[PDB]
Amino acid sequence: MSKQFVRSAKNLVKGYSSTQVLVRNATSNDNHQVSKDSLIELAEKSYDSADFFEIMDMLDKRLNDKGKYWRHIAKALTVIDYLIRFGSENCVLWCRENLYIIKTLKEFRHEDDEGIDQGQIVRVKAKELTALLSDDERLNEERNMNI
Amino acid sequence: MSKQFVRSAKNLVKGYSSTQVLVRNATSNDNHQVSKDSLIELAEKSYDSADFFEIMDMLDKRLNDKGKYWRHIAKALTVIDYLIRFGSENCVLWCRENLYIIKTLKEFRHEDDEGIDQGQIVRVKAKELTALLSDDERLNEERNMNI
């Protein structure tokens, strides 16, 4: 039967739009962090009312991932970082609502494959992130010096 | 209000089709493993392009199950074995893309409440399956002599 579309056949089954996929691509399961361009492109779609909502929800679905998928949670936090600094005000306030999800990720355990502390990058980045969040002074200044 | 038929409602509320239900029943949380009949049924329905997609996703939605459901992950693997061995070629190529889910299952931790680990049953069938999967020569010979 047909062949190379099968990658995109998957996303259709679950009903992911290209915006949901670009987030799913940005938070991939490999190691390469997030591409420099993908972030500003998600920064643009953060203003787009429809896309915006698709983005936020996908990160929350990515933040509450298993112990095994440390990289989803690793990349997700860098994405959430780029939006609160470059994207819309909508982005910051969203995080403030479900702030407990980030505070919980401070303590993430995954030293199982096969002993290496892989889940520290998750802990540290979250702690590093929410530190930037809770303060009001350092937020508004960074945004003014970006746009 | 009603009695035994309420079971079907549970599968209704989540919007499960006949095939989506047959997958969940064969790949249930019992230790009896799948039925030989249920295998060739899902192998046959694998040819049907409508059912074909439901199966893969329901097998995928069951491979990333929690620690507690070790029996789901085991049967799901042994199911994919039958389809890569008997069913439509479409199935095999599906697996080649979501190989990241298969590769990671080589290791899997499950301390078993009573004090055991199976645990390995999940680990081992994965290792044994992908080893069969990765080879191009073993596949093409296996199917031609079965059809």
Author numbering:
A (entry chain A), B (entry chain C): 1 to 147
Wording from the paper:
Accumulation of the adapter proteins at the plasma membrane initiates the endocytic event and contributes to membrane bending. Complex formation has been observed between the ENTH domain of epsin and the ANTH domain of Sla2, the yeast homolog of human huntingtin interacting protein 1 related (Hip1R).
As a further indication that the ENTH2 dimer, which sandwiched PIP2, is functionally relevant, a similar dimer interface is observed in a crystal structure of the epsin Ent1 ENTH domain (ENTH1) from S. cerevisiae at 2.9 Å resolution.
